[PDB]
Design an enzyme around this catalytic site. Structure first.
Site: not given
Ligand SMILES: [Pb+2]
Ligand SMILES: [Pb+2]
Lengths: 497, 497
Positions: B267-268, B271, B297
């Site tokens: 997920h990170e 980003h 996101e």
């Protein structure tokens, strides 16, 4: 209580901003050495520069300068509030001494000189740095004129790195050393007493082994890990103060010669304890924090040499060395002691033992004074350096890297800096005898890891004072006297004879 | 080339300072979560505050504001230089909307409300937070009036967190979801298809095992460790951009339920890749970096859900899980897949599966709109929250901590924030189908760890653009359309049916 005056309070309020940028500069610097991915340097560098100009701009803002002047014209103020003014006056003064155009010239020349020095050292060629050294010499002299000075121009550079230091001061301590320490070195070197080398120097180790030992020693010192301090690794060991409740030190693991990483960590602990044991009523103010390079090195050399190379420290850590180091099952605690105290004149200043170290600084002091006083020629420096290395330590560099090119300082433009190192070694001896008076069981406490009384002694005598008083006034107040090279000579005599 | 205009250049020069403080704020924030010794918080906090005021002061300096206005009155400028102005105009605008006295009130109330919420959640007592929630509701409405808005006051808060977002926009996507996604959930939940839980959830692991797996996955993604990025541990996973060449992400090792640390890191990464693949010609300017929470996101959910919970990703990482996880010798790659895609309505938003997640945001959206529009009463919020949780997911919180008190957002005053999370999940599905068009062998490339074409696709379509265009204009330009909740529904249908 501590800060009562109204003008003082308006100053401190504005100062918080300046203090904040500095807090950020510290973190930036630390992270650059410890965590930053290699390619993040360009952006880190610009950020660092924009803040330095901002900081400088804030310190010299008319409002800030007007308040300081105003407060300086107040007689009601206590020692603390006064300290604020002395400190900030010296800062504003030094900051506006250099014309913005000059600050620019230096930044430029310095940056390019460091790069030119960096390759010149690697390829052993003084010609690639020579011209840069002539430019740096000119800037130094200009700087001395911008700063101002009573006796010699070199007083101005010296005062730049050590508030109140004068050429006459430096001239004195080295006289006492050349006549009383020099012979002691000869005697030591000729009796075969301590060895010039040790086999433990070649013993190899795996990082984790030594980090277990360092960790153990810092815990024995009471270093507040995870709570107010940290220990990490970087190319070169150093200490940073993000705050009174956040001080960090680093070390390096060469992979061999374990003495290095150990004493280096202890050396830095010395710098850290000082910042750590500051007075929290001064938090966010210019009086909090070590007063100078000199007093600071007195603390790092106190812990490194006075304690770290003492027999008691060796006994204390001995069992731990055995547990983590396999090759230690072939050596005794005396072997470790002799190893920790070897004495051998050699080319590199950073490697010099405690007895030969100060001569490395003395020669740098002589070349520096001439460079800024007479019309010295860069092309003629290498030979003067070599003749001096030969006159004091009997050895003569065979290549530029072993001589005049070994240190970065001149290329950074740090002229008048070197003498603060000797001051620390000297003061570390003086301090020892003064604490040896209030705590005669000093050695016994070290062997048993009872350092609280020693830390407390340092706090009351040096640390808590922060930057309230100038270096000299600080010594008189706490030690009842001024620096005296004599102590360092006794310490050495009493340790090697 | 990119920045030609003279007024534009004077802006960018001043902006460097602002950019520098931000660079420092990032490092400060990151270090606070990752390295800072516990007690260093007070000094870290003050430093952080002094800079925020400084930053704000610089952004609103008459000189800076005059230049922006001037440039805004120029028609010669290219898209890039224009982007600078759009971005900075929005910033200066938002920054001066709040009276300094109001910015103060919020800081105060917020700080105290977070602390009151923090204990209220632990002791399951809404009364200790209730009054604070009423104060926060008032500030939100005031804020909406300071900001200004055409249709509803809630448009102003929404626009605060997602440039150009309107209540009508949010109202729409949730309609499409309530009518088309809701049934799909019911169907999924009743066919016993995917399980509501898995035994791998209870499997325990030692930190080092999983950090070997995470490390392996990041290397498979091409995450530039040691060169332009870092991976560390913190209480809560997050990403920071110190620069285009320095982006860092963190994760946490709960010690059990290994899915968490894995997907969280992915997920990170999502980003980070975004910030990492920015255009270096925009370095030091306001156009570099992600355009909004929503687009951001979209990138993290793309990598986490589109790829991380796909069968191919599971096959790719399967062998690595076996190597480092002992308890894995009892499970098959299908077991891992079912585990990665469990679907189960539950109380906690942060734990919700991808199908039930968006309903958690929808309810928060409904309460938020009412809170700022009608005269809602804090004491009446818990029941509305509970009835909504029951109407959408069939379950009803039994304690405040499982309900209205689970998230920090309102106590921080982050009203109008929650909807950007749904936007990302939705956009992550839309993006999938558009890339599925230019790279039909998407799944095959994932199974083989060939991510360069996928990274390159994201770069050209989203990343390189930075903050040149507002969120909406950015989508149209790169995807030929606007956000459409429909894609998310198909994705889910095509994955669970
Ligand atoms: Pb030192
Ligand atoms: Pb995220």
């Amino acid at each position: 209580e501590v800060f009562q005056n109204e003008t003082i309070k308006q100053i401190l309020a504005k100062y918080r901003r300046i203090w904040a940028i500095g807090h950020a500069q510290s973190v930036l610097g630390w992270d650059l050495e410890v965590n930053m991915p290699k390619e993040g340097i360009l952006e880190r560098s610009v950020a660092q520069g924009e803040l330095s100009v901002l900081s400088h701009e804030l310190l010299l803002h008319p409002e800030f300068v007007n308040l300081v002047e105003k407060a300086k014209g107040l007689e009601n103020l206590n020692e603390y509030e006064r300290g604020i003014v002395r400190v900030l006056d010296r800062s504003i003064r030094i900051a506006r001494a250099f014309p913005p155009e000059f600050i620019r010239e230096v930044s430029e020349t310095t940056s390019l000189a460091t790069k030119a020095w960096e390759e010149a050292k690697a390829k052993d060629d003084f010609s690639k740095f020579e011209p840069w050294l002539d430019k740096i010499i000119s800037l130094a002299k200009r700087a001395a004129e911008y700063l101002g000075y009573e006796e010699e121009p070199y007083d101005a550079l010296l005062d730049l790195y050590e508030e109140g230091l004068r050429t006459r001061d430096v001239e004195k301590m080295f006289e006492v050393l050349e006549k009383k320490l020099k012979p002691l070195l000869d005697k030591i070197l000729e009796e075969g007493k301590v060895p010039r080398e040790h086999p433990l120097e070649k013993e190899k180790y795996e990082r984790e082994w030594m980090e277990r030992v360092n960790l153990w020693i810092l815990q024995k010192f009471g270093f507040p890990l995870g709570t107010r301090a940290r220990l990490d690794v970087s190319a070169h060991p150093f200490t940073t103060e993000f705050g009174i409740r956040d001080v960090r030190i680093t070390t390096r693991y060469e992979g061999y010669d374990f003495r290095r990483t150990i004493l280096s960590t202890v050396h830095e602990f010395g710098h850290a304890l000082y910042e750590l044991q500051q007075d929290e009523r001064f938090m966010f103010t210019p009086i909090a924090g070590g007063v100078s390079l000199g007093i600071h090195e007195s603390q790092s050399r106190f812990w490194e040499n006075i304690i770290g190379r003492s027999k008691e420290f060796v006994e204390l850590i001995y069992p731990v060395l055995k547990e983590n180091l396999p090759f230690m099952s072939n050596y005794t605690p005396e072997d470790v002691y002799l190893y920790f105290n070897i004495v051998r004149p050699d080319f590199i200043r950073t490697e010099a033992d405690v007895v030969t170290y100060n001569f490395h600084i003395l020669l740098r002091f002589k070349l520096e004074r001439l460079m800024v006083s007479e019309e010295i020629k860069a092309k003629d420096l290498p030979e003067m350096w070599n003749d001096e290395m030969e006159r004091l330590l009997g050895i003569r560099p065979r290549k530029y890297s072993e001589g005049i090119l070994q240190d970065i300082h001149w290329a950074h433009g740090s002229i008048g800096y070197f003498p603060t190192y000797t001051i620390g070694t000297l003061l570390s001896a003086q301090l020892y005898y003064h604490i040896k008076k209030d705590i005669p069981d000093f050695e016994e406490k070290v062997a048993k890891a009872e350092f609280d009384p020693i830390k407390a002694w340092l706090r009351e005598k040096i640390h808590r004072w922060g930057s309230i008083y100038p270096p000299k006034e600080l010594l008189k107040k706490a030690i009842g006297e001024d620096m005296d090279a004599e102590y360092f000579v006794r310490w050495v005599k009493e340790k090697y004879l």
